[PDB]
Amino acid sequence: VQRGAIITSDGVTLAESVKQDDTYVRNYPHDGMASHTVGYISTQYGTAGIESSMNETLTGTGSSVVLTINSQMQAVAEAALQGYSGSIVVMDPSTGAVLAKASSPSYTHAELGTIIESGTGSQLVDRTTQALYSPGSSFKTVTLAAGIDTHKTTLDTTYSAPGTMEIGGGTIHNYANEDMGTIPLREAFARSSNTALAQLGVALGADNLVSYARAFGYGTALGQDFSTTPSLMPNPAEMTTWELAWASCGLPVGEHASPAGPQTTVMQNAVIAAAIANGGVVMNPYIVDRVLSPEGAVVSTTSPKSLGQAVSADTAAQVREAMLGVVESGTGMGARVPGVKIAGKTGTADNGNFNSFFIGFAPYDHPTLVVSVVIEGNGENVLGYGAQVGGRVLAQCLNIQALGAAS
């Protein structure tokens, strides 16, 4: 039996079964592309990805699986990650379709054995979906959305944003102790003030922060047809005030029975950006576009499915505005690309090294794409790199999407 193929939405075959003049052997053209997603199926080396999760379909002549992944956007994501540990998701904000999904370091089917026998390093980890990180200031997107949706603040409400501040028996600091004095929220957000945003976190309370995070998908195993490990938040009744403050800045510091939080996946970060870009409506991401019978009939198709409306459309619009300012004039100016209006939120989070995040969307006025990035600084300094990569990848992916839409 000839096992079914795995194919991108734009028609590039990534897994196929080739008849020998003698039986069938599994072939991965573009071996190395989208490995964590395609996966594999070996007696010796085990089982992963779509080869595993769609096995009954690929097996039974098998039917073929067409992914949502766009081979061109995927290649772009992959090139952006040459030389780093980290990952990138690109997603259609109105459907939850995953147009690219890249983790680094990665691997080819040809190296698998050697990778596994050696058992050293982390190439098999999918940092889009199976690695949990402190989102840092990227999470303030949520804090802001919730503050606005609950009518606790506005973008023009003023906050004192000093270098340092005492909250709930402990201190909160802006990066490098910068005292920005009294500024409006839109600006504190854009400049990514921890002391400003902490106060809004406190104004919200734990129940609000946690419940809005859950509404964007925390606690849910995101993916209709792929595995994401859930993003974590604490039991709100267990959180201290101080912990609430830092949590709202994207820093998990709780000492309690329930998990510290937030801890996010990059996938979870995309879903937040998507929902904000999609008028507050949260979409459960997916990666299988359709299934082809052995004779090519399109036998099923995955439908987009909402996980709820996390904030009002009004709130979503205010959050988009605030994210525009991040990129036009704030921490995320390295995401700027000439000719396209890009909005987003940056993040940086901590033995000496740290990680750089970015979530964004474009075009500002009628978003059709979303990006989520983490670049792990593994001793190296990668401040502002999340934003660099994100912008660049978004713009490239937009060009590809726009050619595809008119073709």
Ligand SMILES: *C(=O)[C@@H](NC(C)=O)[C@@H]1NC(C(=O)O)=C(C)CS1
């Ligand atoms: C949250 O990520 C904050 N970082 C630290 C070290 O506290 C803010 N991060 C950012 C950012 O947007 O990445 C900057 C540059 C200011 S501090």
